[PDB]
Every structure is written in C-alpha cells, then in structure tokens.
Amino acid sequence: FVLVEMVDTVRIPPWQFERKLNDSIAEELNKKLANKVVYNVGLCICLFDITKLEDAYVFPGDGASHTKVHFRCVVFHPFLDEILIGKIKGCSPEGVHVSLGFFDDILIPPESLQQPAKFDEAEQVWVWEYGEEIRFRVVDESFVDTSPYTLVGSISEPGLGLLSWW
Amino acid sequence: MEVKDANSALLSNYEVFQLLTDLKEQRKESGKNKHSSGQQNLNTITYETLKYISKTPCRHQSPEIVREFLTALKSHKLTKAEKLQLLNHRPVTAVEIQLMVEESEERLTEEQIEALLHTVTS
Amino acid sequence: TEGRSRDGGLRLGEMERDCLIGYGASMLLLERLMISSDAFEVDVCGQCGLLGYSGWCHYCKSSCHVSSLRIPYACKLLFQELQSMNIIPRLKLSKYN
Amino acid sequence: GVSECIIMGIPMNIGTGLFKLLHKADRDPNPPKRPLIFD
Amino acid sequence: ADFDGDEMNLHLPQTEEAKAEALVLMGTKANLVTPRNGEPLIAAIQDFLT
Amino acid sequence: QGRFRGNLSGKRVDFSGRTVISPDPNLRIDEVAVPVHVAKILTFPEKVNKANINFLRKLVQNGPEVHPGANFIQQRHTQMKRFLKYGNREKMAQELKYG
Amino acid sequence: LILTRLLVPPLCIRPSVVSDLKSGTNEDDLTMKLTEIIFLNDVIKKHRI
Amino acid sequence: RITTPYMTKYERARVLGTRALQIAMCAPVMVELEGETDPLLIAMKELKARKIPIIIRRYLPDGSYEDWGVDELIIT
Amino acid sequence: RCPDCGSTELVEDSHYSQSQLVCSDCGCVVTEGVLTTTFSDEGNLREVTYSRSTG
Amino acid sequence: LPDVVLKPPPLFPDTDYKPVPLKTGEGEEYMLALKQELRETMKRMPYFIETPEERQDIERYSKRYMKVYKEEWIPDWRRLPREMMP
Amino acid sequence: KEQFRETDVAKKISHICFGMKSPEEMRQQAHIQVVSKNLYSQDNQHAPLLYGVLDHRMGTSEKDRPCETCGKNLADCLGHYGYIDLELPCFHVGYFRA
Ligand SMILES: [Mg+2]
Ligand SMILES: [Zn+2]
Ligand SMILES: [Zn+2]
Ligand SMILES: [Zn+2]
C-alpha cells in the first residue's frame, strides 16, 4: 500500500451539475480506477484524496465539463521486501497457488528455496512436515493490447521456523 | 493519465482501513442506482479489502497510538520499512522479530527485543 | 453527390465560407463543413505521426500511442495523397486542454 | 490560421472561438487533504 | 433577388450551438445594416415605396 | 475541382435543399416559408429531455406521414436507428428514454 | 530526394467500378501509371538479364 | 477589468449555444420554464433572467486571462 | 436479420434519396447509407479486362 | 515480353559466392583475445560511466553491505575549463 | 487482474510537421510488395490477383469485397499503402530543382 500522485482529465456530463463537483469527481475517479493495475505502478484500490482542482472548462464539442484534477490514490505495491499473510487458494505441481485474502489471486510462489523436501504431487499437498506467510521479492508488469495478469510477483518462504504451524 | 510518483509516501494499514470505512459509509449514505450499475468492481474491491483488513489485527487502532509507536521506535534508529512492517503485523511473539523481520543481524542485541515487544503490545 | 438527378446535396462554395467567416460563426462553419459533410474518426500514432487503423500503427508495430481523432474525410484523403507524393505530414497530437 | 482550422476540422480562433467558457459549478478549490498518520 | 425564376438554397443546422450562433450572429433583425458603410439594406422596396 | 478548392474550402453537405422563390408579404422579415414536402425530408436531431418529452412523444405517434412528426429514433444505449414507418409507433413513444 | 521505391496508395484513392454491362471495369489513371511503371521495371530487368 | 464591460454578440451566441446543448442533454433548469419545448428558448430565458451558470474566460493575446460572469456583464 | 428480436424480414425500400435496410416488424435499421461512384470520375477511370490483367 | 511473377522475391536471395574464410595465425588470435580483454576491462574502468540508478524503494541496514564502492579518477582541472567542475 | 488503459483521449492536433521518408521507411510503412504489373486473375469470378496492383490487402474499393488486412467494410476501411521497388533510381520531379 502506497500513495500515488495522478493528474486526470475527468469529463462530467451536464446532467450531474446539481451534484457537488468534488463528490462527482471523486466518484468518477473511483469508478475509473477500480480493480485496475497501472503499469509500473500496481493495482489501484481507491481514491485517497484530491489535492489540486483547477478551473472546469466546457468544450465546444460534447459540451460536458472537463476538469484537470490532481489527486492521490492508494495502490498495492510492495517494496521488494514486504511481508504478507495470504491463504492457499490452490496448488500446482510447479508451485503453490496462494492468494491474499479476497484481494488478488496472482501470487505464485516458486518452490525452489525451502528445505530439500519440496514437491507438489497434485493432491494439494503443501509441504512435508519437519495464514501463510509471504515475502515479496520482485515486481513485474506486462501489457495486454498487442494486436489490431499484468501482475504476478515472486514470493519467498524462507526457513522462518513457524512455531505456530510447522 | 501519467503518474507523478508511485512511491510518494508509504502508509500503514490503519489509514487504508479508515479510508475504506469512510468510503463505505459515504456510499451507503449516498447510494446511486446508475452509478453503481455502471461499475460494480468498486463495491467488490472495497468490501473485500475491508474484510481482509478486518481479518488482520489492524482493528483497535487510533492515530494517537500510531504516533506514540512511531515516537517510541524513533529512538531505536530503525528504518521506515521495519517499523511499517511491525505496525502492519503487530507481532505478539518475539520470534516474529527474530527471524521474520529482515536486518536481524546486529540489530536485535538480545535486549532491545523486550522493549520492542513492550512497545508493540502497548 | 452534385446533381439533383443523382440525389445530390447543395454545395457551400468558397463564397459561402467567406460569408460564414465574416459572420464569425465558428461552430456553424464547423458543423457544416466538418460534422455534416465528411466527418470521420481516424487513428493517429503519437510517436511517428502517421495514420493507423483499428487502433494500431503498422509503422511502429505498436498500439500504445495510437489515439482516435475527428477529421474531415477530404483531409485524410489529402494526407494519404501527400504521403503518396513523398510529402509525409507528421501529426503531433496533444491534449485539448 | 483560419484556413488550417477549416481544413483540419477544428473551431477557428477567430469569431466565437477566441475565448473560452467556464462552468459556474458548486465546488471548492484546494479541498481539505486527509492527514497522513504514518508520515 | 428579383423573383424571375432564381433558385435559392436552404440549410438546416444539426447542432444546438450552430443553431444559436446562426440565430444570434446571422439574425435578420441584427443584420439590418451592411458593414460596408452602415447603410440599411433591409428596407422598403417597389410597391411599398409607391 | 482540386482537393483544396473542391473538397476542403468548399464541399457539398446534406440536410439542404434548393428551390425557386416567390414573394409573400404576409410574413415577417426574419421568417421564411418552407414547403411541407421539403420539411418532411430535412430532419433535425432533438435530444429527449425532461422538457420536450411529451412533444416528442406526440411527434413519434404521428409518424413520418403526418407533417408534425419524426422519421428516425436513435436510442441512448445502442446506436441502432429505428425507422418510424414500420413497427408500432405507440410502443416506441411509450419507451422514449431520456437522452 | 532521389526515389528508389514508389508508394502505391490504397484503394480509397483509386476507386474501382465493376461495369457488368460490358467485359471490362473502371480504374483510375494512377493504377495505369503504376502498371506502366512496373512494366518498365520488368522490361529493364529483362534487358539487363 | 480592462476589457469592455459590455457582452459582445459572439459571447452571447456561444453562451446560448452551450446552454442549449446542455439543456438538451437533461441539464437542470433555473428559470422554471413554462411550456418551452425548445432548448434555445430556455437558454434565452435564462440569459434574460441572468441565471446562466457560465463564466467567460477572456484570454489576452500575450497569454493573460480574466473571468467574467454572465450576470456581471452587461447585456443589450 | 433483426439484432434484438431475430426477425429476418428485412426489406429494401428507397427513402428520400437514401437507401437502407430495415425490418418491417420492429422498424429497426441494420445498415443505412450506400456508397456509389460519381460520373465525374466514371469518365476519367479507364477500363481493364481480365485477359490483359492476367497476362 | 517479361514473364509475370506471382510471389515476391525472397527477402534474402541466395548467392553462389561465399565470403572468404578469415586469416589464421597466432597474430589474429592474439588480437582477438586482446580485444576481448579490452572489452572486459574497459567497462569496469572509471571512465565507463554507467546510468545513475534512481527511485530507491526503501532504506535498509544492509545498504552499507550492498553499497557499490569504486574509486573515481580526478580530472586535471588545469587543462579542463572551469565549466566542468562539479 | 485487469490492466488500466485509457479508452479515448480528447486529442487535439497542434501542428503538422512536413517531411520526407527514406526508402527503408517506405518499406516499413507499407504492408505488401507489389511486383506484378497485372492485377486480375484468369477465372470467371472477376476477382483481383495477389501481390499485385489493386490487391485487397492495401484497402478496399468495392462494397462487396472487404479488405484483407483489416476485417472491415469499405466505410470502415482507412486504407493501406504499398511499396514498389525500382531497378534504377529516378529523380523526384517535385524536388528535382531542389
Ligand atoms: Mg434573377
Ligand atoms: Zn507509430
Ligand atoms: Zn426489431
Ligand atoms: Zn484496410
């Protein structure tokens, strides 16, 4: 979770003029930045606040109200060393499928660093004994449109001990 | 649609929880039919993130407690990431600070851990 | 088209454009000569300044800088003919603000 | 110029297009910012 | 015009802004005088002067 | 007849007519008489709002045959036009949404 | 400034009319000029060979 | 404050056109129209009543600007 | 056919100098406007046959 | 008359002449090895200025352990004009 | 889950920068190479040839035959250019004096 400064040109139709301008701007920014991943930024959650809001122009075309709004919004982007607590939403032979609680099913931990008893035989077996912890390692983003996802990240689970659960 | 700074200021989970609660109450007090039907992903992401934060011990927090915790940890020369993780996780056990918290070498000193536990539990 | 037997429309000649300019009606002239006559939406790439298709630039093999733009169809025909004459018009787009 | 505005299909700078219009909407410039507790 | 068989054109705008600009700037009551010398052109004519 | 003079500076448009003139002193100086036949061809796009809804309803109910009326209806959600000469015009008038 | 490739324009600039009334078509002069240019290129290549 | 306080005909035409385009798109009315099915008539009534929520942004050639309200300007 | 109801009773009828496809049941059009060549270009365009254009 | 072609010519037409093999000997191999050594030792040279990294995520105690250290040559400011001093 | 991309921007053209294209840029912009001086086939359907003039990969000009590059009709097809190689270079008359 981190704040991101953005500058957006929001278009409000004329039938929303009776509403307050700031409230409608916040609603439009939330509707435009909900469950979406900005490249090299991360998955945005919602709008945090609006810092600068300049004059509202009206163009000779559509005729709506165009406002350039400077705002700060919260996004989910670790700092390459953040510790998280997720739940195992599946498991593949090449790696377990852990998902943050109802947040995003995109965490794919590679099983190549635990103690030498690592294997997944497709029977949802996590690991042989001697709330699941997660150590983000690197971020990675990709595009979608290439003809006329985008966030997975690598997850580490070192020899943390885990006296509560093996 | 360009961004100015993706790492402007790090914030803990308490600010996110407060923002989610405020947005939820403003939504339930100003619910619109067409605005909701236009994009329903907003309600879903807000509700699920609020539920995830509720599953965490992030509750029972206040800005005064966060300020006191920050002032207490400022005397321990720790970095911003360590105190951020300690605030977001609220470790009740010492082993969470011993092994899970990074930069453990030359930082634990086997004596400061008790003070860290007493501060995080207060 | 031109003729009445060909189901043609009237022609706002150069003198009509001069009169509309003298009156100062910019929106009326825009509606007559652009909106109601040969309005079209083309795709222009913001990197090389060339014309694309279906939101894709074959020149740069990318589609991130391609944006839609309203234009008279005669202007697009002129741009294509000039590109055929090795006179390449490079359009540098920008926000309306 | 006016000729390029007519050719490209944009409103000309002369006439009614010399100035711009603003909407007198109910707003508040520089709204109060949420204070940051962690920073 | 002289009503001797001359054909005239009639256009209908397809925009409210264009309609308003035509009614205001090109209004008949607002263009009763020519900008050349200010002399009024829309005035009485034959069978009205007599 | 080039592109600049024949297709850029001066070009042909639609929604226009050409007819012979005739005198009529019983009309104001800012008014002009339009034949019924040409009036049924040249159409104006009016947007459905809270003010002229009951007027556009009657215009649609009249149909393209009666002079006061309309010819096409473009929905707000979908841009598929609907011709008023076919189909039940009463249902179309009763299902006139804003926009 | 010295051309080695010729940019043949799209079909939007060169309209093609299907005249089914006779055994023929209708193509603009640019198509004929490009055909003659390609024919001259082929003739030059044949003479070079 | 240095320009002419009178509202020109071009500004009048543009303001009326913008107001008619807005009202045609289900904009709120502030003059309590009485059976006016034409948006331009409603725009003219709002202009005569001086209730149009539009502020003209006159730009100087060098780059400076100034805001003038419709109710602040003088109409003819 | 009709996009909403699926009726395939689309009839070609000439409007006021306009050609379009419309269904007789719901009066909804599926394709309006037609592109035709002008005689101004017809006299300029030259003829090409299949044999000469094949070799 | 020239015949008509249905497919465009190949993007890389074949040629019956092949490039002459390179010269052999101890000299060419020594020059190759020395050029490789220069490539390897010239990137670590202080004259090889790399792109300055920016936008650090966080500060950590291991920074001093991962701090890149490299000696920097001191340019002779007597010969160089004054406009290049930091 | 989903990547944030802008749908449409109110882009306004600022200025037109005229210039010229190198022979490599002509190949890069064009889609297919026109090498055959002929345009039509030998059958009886009256269809055009491939890799020649009037090919439908460089746009369309008939209401029944759509473009092959982009799957759109005539009203939606913007057109595509082609490049033709010359054995010997020629002076460009428009720039000849220059
Ligand atoms: Mg006469
Ligand atoms: Zn490009
Ligand atoms: Zn139907
Ligand atoms: Zn095409």
Q: What is the DSSP letter of H74?
A: B
* Resolution of the experimental structure, in angstroms: 3.4
Token pair of J41 as six digits:
């030792």
E32 close contact with H: CB closer than 8 A = no
Closest Cβ–Cβ partner in B79, B106, B107 for J58: B79
CA of E7 to the centre of ligand 1 (A): 9
* Whether A132 contacts A87, CB under 8 Å: yes
Nearest CA in chain B to A100: B52
For A117, other C-beta atoms within 10 Å of its C-beta total 9
CA distance F84 to F67: 13
CA distance I44 to G31: 12
Token pair of B62 as six digits:
């206040």
In the beta sheet, which residues pair with residue A53? A69
Exposed / middle / buried, residue B97 (Cβ in 10 Å: 0-12, 13-18, 19+):
buried
CA distance H18 to C65: 32
CA distance A36 to A43: 6
Position of tokens 């099915």?
A: H37
CA nearest neighbour of C30 among K11, F14, H40, D7:
D7
Q: What are phi and psi of G4, to 5 degrees?
A: -120, -20
Question: Judging by DSSP bridges, how do beta strands C51-52 and C66-72 pair with one another?
Answer: unpaired
Exposed / middle / buried, residue F40 (Cβ in 10 Å: 0-12, 13-18, 19+):
middle
Tell me the three state secondary structure of residue E33. strand
CATH number of A2-76: 3.30.1490.120
What distance in Å separates residue A21's CA from the closest CA in chain B? Answer: 15
CA of I4 to the centre of ligand 3 (A): 5
B83 close contact with A: CB closer than 8 A = no
The one-letter amino acid at A10: V
Those residues with Cβ within 8 angstroms of residue A1's Cβ, 6 or more apart along the chain or in another chain: A45, A74, A75, A76, A77, B10, B11, B12, B13, B16
CA nearest neighbour of A139 among A47, A3, A37:
A37
CA of C61 to the centre of ligand 2 (A): 7
CB contact under 8 A, K4 and A66: no
CB < 8 Å from G in window 1-55 of I: 37, 41-42, 44-50
CA distance A19 to A21: 6
The one-letter amino acid at F23: P
Chains contacting chain A through 3 or more C-beta pairs under 8 A: B, C, D, H, J, K
CA distance K21 to K32: 17
* Residues on chain E touching H17 (C-beta within 8 angstroms): 15-21
Those residues with Cβ within 8 angstroms of residue B108's Cβ, 6 or more apart along the chain or in another chain: B97, B98
CA distance B14 to A160: 26
CB < 8 Å from D in window 63-92 of C: 70-72, 75, 78
Token pair of I20 as six digits:
């379009």
H42: region left, alpha or beta (phi > 0 left; psi from -120 to 50 alpha): alpha
For I41, other C-beta atoms within 10 Å of its C-beta total 12
CA nearest neighbour of A118 among A94, A147, A101:
A94
CA of G15 to the centre of ligand 2 (A): 27
Tell me the three state secondary structure of residue E9. strand
Breaks (C-N over 2.5 A) in chain G follow: none
Q: Domain count of chain H?
A: 1
CA distance E2 to E8: 12
* Whether F82 contacts I27, CB under 8 Å: yes
CA nearest neighbour of A16 among A53, A55, A65:
A65
Q: What is the DSSP letter of B79?
A: -
CA nearest neighbour of H26 among F52, A111, K49:
F52
CA distance K82 to K80: 7
Those residues with Cβ within 8 angstroms of residue F46's Cβ, 6 or more apart along the chain or in another chain: F52, F56, H24
CA nearest neighbour of C94 among C71, C60, C65, C73:
C65
CA distance B12 to K13: 44
* Whether H42 contacts H18, CB under 8 Å: no
Token pair of A26 as six digits:
């916040």
CA of C85 to the centre of ligand 2 (A): 20
Chains contacting chain D through 3 or more C-beta pairs under 8 A: A, B, C, F, H, K
CA distance G24 to C38: 31
Q: Which helix (H) or strand (E) holds A135?
A: strand A132-136
G10 close contact with C: CB closer than 8 A = yes
Those residues with Cβ within 8 angstroms of residue K88's Cβ, 6 or more apart along the chain or in another chain: G44
CA distance G16 to K58: 13
Q: What is the DSSP letter of D21?
A: E
Nearest CA in chain E to H38: E16
For D30, other C-beta atoms within 10 Å of its C-beta total 10
Range of the domain at H53: 1-76
Q: Length of chain H, please?
A: 76
CA of I48 to the centre of ligand 3 (A): 43
Token pair of F2 as six digits:
């080039």
Chains contacting chain K through 3 or more C-beta pairs under 8 A: A, C, D, G, I, J
* Whether A69 contacts A7, CB under 8 Å: yes
H53 close contact with D: CB closer than 8 A = yes
- Best mutation target among K27, K28, K31, K51 (most J Cβ atoms within 10 Å) is K51
K2 close contact with A: CB closer than 8 A = yes
Instruction: Please give the full DSSP string across chain I, using - where no structure is assigned.
Output: --SSS----EEEEE-SS-EEEEETTT-BEEEE------HHHHTTSBP--TTTTT-
CA distance D11 to C29: 8
A102: region left, alpha or beta (phi > 0 left; psi from -120 to 50 alpha): left
Torsion sign, CA atoms K50, K56, K62, K65:
positive
Nearest CA in chain C to K72: C54
CA distance K55 to K46: 13
Tell me the three state secondary structure of residue A87. strand
I15: region left, alpha or beta (phi > 0 left; psi from -120 to 50 alpha): beta
Position of tokens 């067409």?
A: B34
CB contact under 8 A, D9 and C21: no
In the beta sheet, which residues pair with residue K90? G3
Token pair of E12 as six digits:
């209908």
CA atoms within 13 A on the CB side of F40: 14
Q: b/e map of J6-37 (b: 16 or more CB within 10 Å)?
A: eeeeeeeeeeeeeeeeeeeeeeeeeeeeeeee
CA nearest neighbour of F84 among F68, F69, F67:
F69
Ligand nearest to the CA of I2: 3
Tell me the three state secondary structure of residue A134. strand
For residue C5, say whether it is annotated as part of any ligand binding site: yes
3-state helix, strand, coil in chain H (%, to 5): 35, 15, 45
* Whether G5 contacts K84, CB under 8 Å: yes
Sequence-separated contacts (24+) of C50-56 with Cβ below 8 Å: C50/C83, C50/C88, C50/C90, C50/C91, C50/K29, C51/C76, C51/C79, C51/C80, C51/K78, C52/K78, C53/A148, C53/K69, C53/K70, C53/K77, C53/K78, C53/K80, C54/A148, C54/K70, C54/K72, C55/A145, C55/A148, C56/A147, C56/A148
Token pair of B85 as six digits:
């993780």
CA of J69 to the centre of ligand 1 (A): 94
Cα–Cα separations (whole angstroms), residue A147 to C11, C61, C62, C63, J69:
41, 9, 8, 8, 46
* Residues on chain C touching G15 (C-beta within 8 angstroms): none
Instruction: Please give the full DSSP string across K6-75, using - where no structure is assigned.
Output: -S---EEEEEEEEE---HHHHHHH-SSB--BS--B-SSSS--B-SSBTT-GGG---SSSS--SSSS--TT
Those residues with Cβ within 8 angstroms of residue H4's Cβ, 6 or more apart along the chain or in another chain: none
Torsion of CA J40, J41, J47, J53, to 10 degrees: 50
Method of determination?
A: cryo-EM
* Whether B27 contacts A46, CB under 8 Å: no
CB contact under 8 A, A15 and H53: no
Torsion sign, CA atoms K63, K69, K72, K74:
negative
* Residues on chain C touching D16 (C-beta within 8 angstroms): 24-27
Token pair of A133 as six digits:
């912890």
Q: Quickly list H helices, chain A.
A: 21-32
